[PDB]
Design a protein around this ligand. Structure first.
Ligand code: VE7
Length: 188
């Protein structure tokens, strides 16, 4: 078998029902997550290898960064509620890891302000029960698979990507193996 459990992916002991087709977990504090987003563009290359109907879901996690870690998960909920993931992902990553200018909830907000989101919209979304729910959903999804590491990707609540079984001498080969794997799992 060219794909085998334990190599390119692992299988969940207890599967999760009702999960999204493709589910990614990441942390703006997470060094490999910065690489998947800015250097390797994992999500985008996965997306391009799937049918157009497949739903990709990406969630932030709490277990890195203490207080800011949770602030970031609420802010990611704001980003999803407002639909501006594509406007704030890069500045969030660089604020936390490149310039290290994100050191409080107020600096996170600055990112959205600079990115074009009006102060009133941000604060209204930040404090909304819609966002509280989106925070709960992110947490719940993570809880379902006892997530202790990011970046992580799960396919149909049953399969987890195992980047440790993939060649890393070449960034492009590595993301294609990763993307081709997601496609193979999406079809099991
Ligand atoms: C859930 O926990 C985990 C999450 C991710 C990893 C992981 O992240 C990785 C990133 C890269 C990389 C990134 C940017 C350029 C680049 O150059 C080609 C290579 C390469 C390999 C890995 C691995 C696997 C391993 O460590 O063997 C491990 C554990």
């Amino acid at each position: 078998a060219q794909y085998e459990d334990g190599k390119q992916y692992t299988t969940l002991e207890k599967p999760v029902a009702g999960a999204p087709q493709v589910l990614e977990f990441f942390s703006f504090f997470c060094p490999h997550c910065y690489q998947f987003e800015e250097v390797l563009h994992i999500s985008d290359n996965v997306k391009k290898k799937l049918p157009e109907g497949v739903k990709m879901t990406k969630y932030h996690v709490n277990f890195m960064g203490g207080d800011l870690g949770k602030d970031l998960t609420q802010a990611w909920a704001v980003a999803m509620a407002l639909g501006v993931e594509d406007k704030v992902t890069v500045p969030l990553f660089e604020g936390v890891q490149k310039t290290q200018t994100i050191r409080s909830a107020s600096d996170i907000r600055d990112v959205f302000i600079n990115a074009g989101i009006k102060g009133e919209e941000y604060d209204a979304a930040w404090n909304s029960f819609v966002v509280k729910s989106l925070v709960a959903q992110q947490e719940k999804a993570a809880a379902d698979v006892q997530l202790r590491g990011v970046p992580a990707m799960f396919v149909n609540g049953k399969y987890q990507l195992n980047p440790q079984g993939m060649d890393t001498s070449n960034m492009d080969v590595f993301v294609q193996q990763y993307a081709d794997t997601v496609k193979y799992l999406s079809e099991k």
